[PDB]
Write a protein that binds this ligand. Structure first.
Ligand SMILES: C=C(C)[C@H]1Cc2c(ccc3c2O[C@@H]2COc4cc(OC)c(OC)cc4[C@@H]2C3=O)O1
Ligand code: SF4
Ligand code: SF4
Ligand code: SF4
Ligand code: SF4
Ligand code: FES
Ligand SMILES: [Mg+2]
Lengths: 48, 97, 112, 115, 125, 230, 208, 376, 176
């Protein structure tokens, strides 16, 4: 996070390069976020 | 915010206004995403006494429309459906754009 | 005198008093050919006579507009013309006659 | 008696006159329809279809019903002449992708429960 | 102007219904029976026209209930049986009508529960 | 002749002697709310849901049991009748279990429907609820007696129609319970009908349990072929 | 009675009743009934032949001046001998009022087109023709407006099936979109929701 | 076609580029909404009004709710009415932004669209916070509103509202005094007052011709008689005057929003009548009456006394009306929907006489047509 | 109360005439519009870096449906069929029977996600918080059939998203 950016750019995730079985170096998608970090990332809550 | 002061001056001169006063991006002045729990008061029908539903039943006070002049059954001044509307007033705030 | 009536396609009327007098006189003349017992004739005569007296009694346009409650005397002229056309039409229609037909027994029964 | 109000025709003779006029119009239109829509049918097929559609409602004995049928036919014709219809709409009259449903008792008994 | 049409009403050619659903359909005109699980009678006041049940099968996927009958959900409400019959006749449907069944008037007597010599006496209360 | 004139909401109607207030109201097309009255059973008068006001009478009468008197004026929609219905509905719901989602009677409940049509919309009951143990009366009638409103319809049906005296009430007061008092099976060729007359989910069909809701069922009126009665 | 119940307005009720009496007195030839609803809405039930006179009066009389046509539509009631109920909703800006005019027709009896009175009626009348099949006499250009080209039937009729009779799909053999008899993988599930107990005593009907 | 504003088949007879005849063909978005509504309960038919005019969703919800409330003879609570007026003004801002920016985009100026759609995104965020849906909220119900505002929504609405006037000023800097924009808009599609009245126009299409008529002022609903705002009135009856009217309406909506924010009262959000409005979940899980009423409301729905009503509101596109007919059951017998776009499109051919192709594109843009409400 | 938007008269003095002539000949307002666009060019854009950054959402958000359990691992659904009765799109199909232990449970629970309008009426109607609309919205498929959810899929969704679903419900159940 960085709270000096405007709302929307103040939280982000650098995805892993190796998910369950597939190589996610280039192929990433928002579905790879687990539900708890999904709640934090979409600003449904302030607490990680 | 992050813009250098020279860029802000150029923006202000080009737009003609002070942009930094009213920025269209929300930085930190908005409400927190986590809030305390609410309490949400109850309505006027939450009494424990003198609250019989028959006295506050609005659905049961509807009646079939009142019939005037069934065909199957003095000067008499002419009438209108309603009084004529008053003329509108011209906006003492700002009458002309 | 006045410019910009304010409604698009409604021209400013010069000499509105004479136009209103002519229109109301024509309306009364047309109503004179309707049977006396007809409600439309007496109602329209009453309202037309009130408006004609108001027009005759008030030489000022703005005060006349405030008295007539008719909205900006040009629209009063337009309404007078509409009433004249309606008077001719109802003379051709004769709606004062008894009811032409009675509806079936339950035509207006609701619910079902 | 029966206290009915006409639409255009007072008796059946005028209704048949209007029907003949509409049939003339459709018969004249068919070749232009085949050309403009680039239909793969012949003009004889189109005129046969027009005749069949007309014969579908031959049993009517009410002049008002005939009048409404003529109004609908004129609507369809004006719709075809102005190319508001597409080739799919014109070709819908022929049911080229519908399998022939049998009408005899035995085949109906074989296929299913519907009469 | 009146023209004095002498024929019976028939609007089948104008309704746009396919002929298969005009000739082979049988409608029922009836006052629906009271649901035996409840005592209210508000659902036994109007006449109903409903169509004959057709085939329903299982969808190969998801096992749902599939139909090919467009009139399977059509129910019409009428004030009287004459109106329903007239509607069905002018629409060209064969119909079966059932006369309205009303409960017969019953003689009730609370005192009969305590008869001196009759069998209506109750053994419990 | 022997007919007497009575009034329902000021509307005149001619009735036979011995006709009850409920039947006179039924003559003009008005249905009085009920829980214990069944027109094919004996009159009980215990549920008290049928109380209506008679004009110039300070006491409401039980319409299911009280015969009409000549010249009476039944006021079925007066404030007194509505308040009586609301009070009775409140008392009936005081100890009822919050079982509607799991009750088979869900969309077919006379208690639910009469609560929506004639009762109040809120509860002012702040105590614990009573709960009774279930009875086993066979494999056909499922028994959940906490839903019982003690209308005694099943007892009257068994005693009078089925010809069996196996059902009754044990105890008294708030603790009065409908049952057999012993492990007994209520088997008769007419037993299942007690499911129909029971206005609540206290008696339900065991083979039918949980399978369907009433609003999604399609009704087909047909004939029975399991015997020659038709 | 105070918080949850909609308040009444007796002044508007009296004004609408007086104006309904006025209209009924002026046009006895066509007016059959006048009603004022409990929420202060005025309705006039007329004979079909008076569609053009009545409306004209209501648009041109100095005391009516109903110069706006808010809406024109139809209602299908199969139990009536005259199936269709034609409703005109009119607005008067001069007197800030609204009026409803109702009449009736059946499948074979045409209604007079009122495009000469209100130009707004045009499309509305077309819509009534398309959804209900009510013919309007002397309509400048009467044809379907809402339904597909070549569509048979009138969908808003009560006896018309909800899903219709035909469905569309692309066919690769004829290489075009074709229409076929309708088949549903899941049939629409009809719900019987009406409670067997009466809800509104004020609308109870006589027991016939 | 990008300028078709959705599914419209405008068959045009042209002499060169001069328009000789316009024939709008509609029904490409006719989904048969009214029959389907006839197959639903009153609560089940509410989300259809979201999808009627998919730019003024909550205004359509409000119109339907007013009709059903009138038929039920009940009254929404004051806080619900203030919430309704506030979100109706926010919806008016959304609709006017969409209309003006798509009109400019059709004319050729594509830039203000991107500037104003960020504000549209923020208002979508308000919608989602109040309801859980950015467009189809189903929030305004025939008893009030579904849920109360979250505990920090008013502050964010205030923060958004105090910066919107500068965005309007930037839009006006782009368009108002531009000679190209004036050339493309002035004297184009001129309609007279009497023609506008006879053709059934409403909203800006009247006010641009000088007719002084606003339903919020003449026939107020909810708490619209307790707010102060001016009505913009045109002088020439052309596209430029209507554009100015819509900009000034956005400013007046900001005014009304400020008044609503400062005047929000406390209290309950739906009518305290459990036979119409569902009880709270805690009551439904503790009280027997509440559970019975919740069950019956969500299975059968409330019954509405028999009768017919025509309820109209001042939606951002004009007068929006419902003719609702109840037969006494829990399902509406008839629901006719009156949309202003129907009459506006029916008058399009009249307004395009003596104009070119680009002028017709401008006239379609200035009519503010959404075809969900036109076709239904 | 009304105001005029286009009822102003230009000044006819020589200075005003010359100013208007300068505006006509030297294109002042066009340069004003150019200045507005130039000012926007130097601002920070409003774009976010999807999928690494996400748009803000709310605990009330309506996404993919899920069937929940009690803390014991028993299902919450009792097959009352209220959600099926309230569903405006008829998207829910339910079949039920007594379980082997006599429990009232579903044997079929389908939601057609191509019929669903995502209105959330089902979770309002549910008396045991059994069916919910979760926070997930990234569940696009490559085939139509993958959007026809059965009970196994919904139970799987509940087990997968329960950690976020419970937290979302905890932050909003006092508004319900
Ligand atoms: C071009 C970019 C900047 C934007 C604008 C835009 C799209 C994509 C598609 C369309 C579009 O605008 C045109 C004109 O305005 C509406 C308005 C509509 O309803 C408000 C509507 O509904 C289908 C459709 C349209 C057009 C069309 O589909 O992205
Ligand atoms: S008996 Fe009736 S009120 Fe009681 S739980 Fe069953 S359905 Fe609900
Ligand atoms: S079990 Fe049912 S029928 Fe028997 S007394 Fe109880 S409520 Fe009445
Ligand atoms: S969200 Fe709405 S449409 Fe979707 S399943 Fe639930 S009730 Fe049905
Ligand atoms: S999900 Fe909820 S509402 Fe639906 S059947 Fe199960 S318990 Fe009932
Ligand atoms: S019905 Fe009369 S006391 Fe029960
Ligand atoms: Mg039972």
């Amino acid at each position: 996070e960085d709270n000096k950016q405007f709302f929307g750019r103040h939280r982000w995730v650098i995805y892993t390069t190796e998910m369950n079985g597939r190589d996610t170096f280039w192929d990433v998608d928002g579905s790879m976020v687990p539900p708890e970090w999904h709640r934090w990332l979409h600003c449904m809550t302030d607490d990680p | 915010a992050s813009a250098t002061r020279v860029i802000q001056l150029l923006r202000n001169w080009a737009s003609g206004r002070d942009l930094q006063a009213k920025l269209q991006l929300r930085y930190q002045e908005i409400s927190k995403r986590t809030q305390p729990p609410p309490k949400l008061p109850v309505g006027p029908s939450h009494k424990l006494s003198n609250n019989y539903y028959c006295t506050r039943d609005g659905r049961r006070e509807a009646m079939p429309p009142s019939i005037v002049m069934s065909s199957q059954k003095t000067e008499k001044k002419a009438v209108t459906p309603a009084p004529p509307i008053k003329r509108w007033e011209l906006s003492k705030d700002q009458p002309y754009l | 005198l006045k410019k910009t009536t304010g409604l698009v396609g409604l021209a400013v009327c010069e000499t509105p008093h004479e136009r209103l007098k002519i229109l109301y006189t024509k309306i009364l003349d047309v109503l004179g050919q309707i049977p006396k017992n007809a409600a439309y004739r007496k109602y329209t005569e009453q309202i037309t006579n009130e408006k004609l007296g108001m027009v005759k009694a008030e030489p000022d346009v703005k005060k006349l507009e405030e008295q007539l409650q008719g909205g900006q005397i040009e629209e009063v002229i337009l309404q007078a013309e509409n009433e004249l056309s309606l008077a001719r039409k109802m003379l051709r229609w004769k709606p004062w006659e008894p009811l032409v037909e009675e509806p079936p027994a339950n035509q207006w029964k609701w619910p079902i | 008696g029966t206290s009915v109000k006409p639409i255009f025709s007072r008796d059946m003779n005028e209704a048949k006159r209007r029907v003949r006029e509409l049939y003339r119009a459709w018969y004249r239109e068919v070749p232009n329809t085949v050309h403009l829509f680039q239909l793969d049918i012949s003009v004889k097929q189109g005129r046969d279809k027009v005749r069949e559609m007309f014969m579908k409602n031959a049993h009517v004995t009410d002049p008002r019903v005939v009048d409404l049928l003529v109004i609908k036919g004129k609507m369809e014709l004006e719709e075809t002449i102005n190319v508001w219809k597409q080739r799919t709409h014109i070709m819908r009259f022929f049911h080229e992708t519908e399998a022939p449903r049998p009408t005899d008792f035995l085949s109906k008994f074989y296929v299913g429960h519907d009469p | 102007q009146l023209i004095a049409v002498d024929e019976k009403l028939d609007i089948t050619t104008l309704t746009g219904v396919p002929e298969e659903h005009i000739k082979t359909r049988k409608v029922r005109i009836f006052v629906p029976a009271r649901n035996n699980m409840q005592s209210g009678v508000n659902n036994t006041k109007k006449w109903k026209m409903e169509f004959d049940t057709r085939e329903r099968w299982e969808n190969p996927l998801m096992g749902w209930s599939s139909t090919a009958d467009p009139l399977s959900n059509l129910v019409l409400t009428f004030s009287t049986k004459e109106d329903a019959v007239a509607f069905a006749e002018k629409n060209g449907w064969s119909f079966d009508v059932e006369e309205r069944k009303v409960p017969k008037p019953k003689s009730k007597s609370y005192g009969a529960n305590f008869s001196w010599n009759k069998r209506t006496r109750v053994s419990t209360k | 002749s022997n007919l007497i004139e009575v009034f329902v909401d000021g509307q005149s109607v001619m009735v036979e002697p011995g006709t009850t207030v409920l039947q006179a109201c039924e003559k003009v097309g008005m249905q009085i709310p009920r829980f214990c009255y069944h027109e094919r059973l004996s009159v009980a008068g215990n549920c008290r849901m049928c109380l209506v006001e008679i004009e110039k009478a300070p006491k409401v009468v039980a319409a299911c049991a009280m015969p009409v008197m000549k010249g009476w004026n039944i006021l079925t929609n007066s404030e007194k009748s509505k308040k009586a219905r609301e009070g009775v509905m409140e008392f009936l719901l005081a100890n009822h279990p919050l079982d509607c989602p799991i009750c088979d009677q869900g969309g077919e409940c006379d208690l639910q429907d009469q609560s929506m049509m004639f009762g109040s919309d809120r509860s002012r009951f702040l105590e614990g609820k009573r709960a009774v143990e279930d009875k086993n009366i066979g494999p056909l009638v499922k028994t959940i007696m906490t839903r019982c409103i003690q209308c005694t319809r099943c007892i009257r049906f068994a005693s009078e129609i089925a010809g069996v005296d196996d059902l009754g009430t044990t105890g008294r007061g708030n603790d009065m319970q409908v049952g057999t008092y012993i492990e007994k099976m209520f088997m008769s060729e007419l037993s299942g009908n007690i499911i129909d007359i029971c206005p609540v989910g206290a008696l339900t069909s065991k083979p039918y349990a949980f399978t369907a809701r009433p609003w999604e069922t399609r009704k087909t009126e047909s004939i029975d072929v399991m015997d020659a009665v038709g | 009675t105070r918080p949850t119940i909609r308040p009444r307005n007796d002044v508007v009720h009296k004004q609408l009743s007086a104006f309904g009496q006025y209209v009924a007195e002026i046009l006895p030839k066509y007016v059959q009934q006048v009603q004022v609803s409990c929420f202060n809405e005025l309705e006039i039930f007329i004979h079909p032949d008076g569609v053009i006179p009545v409306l004209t009066f209501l648009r041109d009389h100095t005391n009516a001046q109903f110069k706006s046509l808010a809406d024109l539509t139809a209602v299908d009631v199969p139990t009536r001998q005259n199936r269709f109920e034609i409703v005109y909703n009119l607005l008067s800006l001069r007197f800030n009022s609204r009026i409803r005019v109702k009449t009736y027709t059946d499948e074979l009896t045409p209604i007079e087109s009122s495009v000469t009175v209100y130009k707004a009626a045009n499309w509305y009348e077309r819509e009534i023709w398309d959804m209900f099949g009510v013919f309007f006499a002397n309509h400048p250009d009467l044809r379907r407006i809402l339904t597909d080209y070549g569509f048979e039937g009138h969908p808003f009729r009560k006896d018309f099936p909800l899903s219709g009779y035909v469905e569309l799909r692309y066919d690769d053999e004829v290489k075009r979109v074709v229409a076929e008899p309708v088949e549903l993988a899941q049939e629409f599930r009809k719900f019987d929701l009406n409670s067997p107990w009466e809800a509104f005593p004020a609308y109870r009907q006589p027991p016939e | 076609h990008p300028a078709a504003h959705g599914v419209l088949r405008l068959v045009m007879e042209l002499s060169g580029e001069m328009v000789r005849k316009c024939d709008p063909h509609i029904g490409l978005l006719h989904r048969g909404t009214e029959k389907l509504i006839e197959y639903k309960t009153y609560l089940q038919a509410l989300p259809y009004f979201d999808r009627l005019d998919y730019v003024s969703m909550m205004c359509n919800e409000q119109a339907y709710s007013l009709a059903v409330e009138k038929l039920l003879n009940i009254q929404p609570p004051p806080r619900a009415q203030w919430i309704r007026v506030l979100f109706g003004e926010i919806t008016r801002l959304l609709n006017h932004i969409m209309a003006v920016t798509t009109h400019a985009l059709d004319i050729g100026a594509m830039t203000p669209f991107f500037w104003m759609f960020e504000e549209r995104e923020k208002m979508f965020e308000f919608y989602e916070r109040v309801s859980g849906a950015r467009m189809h909220a189903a929030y305004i119900r025939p008893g009030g509103v579904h849920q109360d505002l979250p505990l920090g929504l008013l502050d964010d609405i205030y923060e958004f509202s105090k910066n919107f006037s500068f965005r309007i000023d930037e839009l006006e800097e782009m368009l108002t005094n531009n000679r190209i924009w004036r050339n493309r808009t002035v004297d184009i599609g001129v309609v007279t007052a009497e023609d506008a009245l006879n053709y059934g126009f409403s909203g800006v299409m009247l006010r641009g011709s000088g007719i002084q008529w606003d339903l919020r002022k003449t026939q107020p609903y909810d708490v619209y008689d307790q707010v102060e705002f001016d009505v913009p009135i045109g002088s020439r009856g052309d596209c430029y005057d209507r554009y100015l009217c819509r900009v000034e309406e956005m400013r007046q909506s900001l005014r009304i929003i400020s008044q609503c924010l400062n005047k929000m009262p406390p209290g309950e959000i739906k009518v305290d009548d459990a036979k119409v409005s569902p009880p709270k979940r805690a009551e439904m899980k503790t009280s027997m009456e509440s559970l019975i009423h919740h069950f019956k409301l969500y299975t059968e729905g409330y019954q509405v006394p028999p009768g017919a009503t025509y309820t109209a509101i001042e939606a951002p596109k004009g007068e929006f009306g419902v003719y609702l007919v109840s037969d006494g059951s829990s399902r509406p017998y008839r629901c006719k929907i009156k949309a202003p776009g129907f009459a506006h499109l029916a008058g399009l051919d009249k307004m395009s006489k003596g104009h070119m192709l680009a002028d017709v594109v401008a006239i379609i843009g200035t009519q503010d047509i959404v075809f969900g409400e036109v076709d239904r | 109360t009304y105001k005029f938007v286009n009822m102003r008269e230009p000044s006819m003095d020589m200075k005003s005439v010359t100013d208007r002539a300068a505006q006509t000949l030297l294109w002042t307002e066009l340069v004003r519009g150019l200045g507005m666009t130039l000012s926007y060019l130097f601002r920070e854009p409003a774009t976010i870096n999807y999928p690494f950054e996400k748009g803000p959402l709310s605990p009330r958000f309506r996404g993919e449906h899920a069937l929940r359990r009690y803390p014991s691992g028993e299902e919450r659904c009792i097959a009352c069929k209220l959600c099926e009765a309230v569903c405006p799109a008829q998207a829910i199909t339910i079949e039920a029977e007594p379980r082997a232990d006599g429990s009232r449970r579903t044997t079929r629970y389908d939601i057609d996600m191509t019929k669903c309008i995502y209105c959330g009426f089902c979770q309002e109607a549910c008396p045991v918080d059994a069916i919910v609309e979760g926070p997930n919205f990234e569940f696009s498929t490559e085939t139509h059939e993958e959007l026809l959810y059965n009970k196994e899929k919904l139970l799987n969704n509940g087990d997968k998203w329960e950690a976020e679903i419970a937290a979302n419900i905890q932050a909003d159940y006092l508004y319900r």
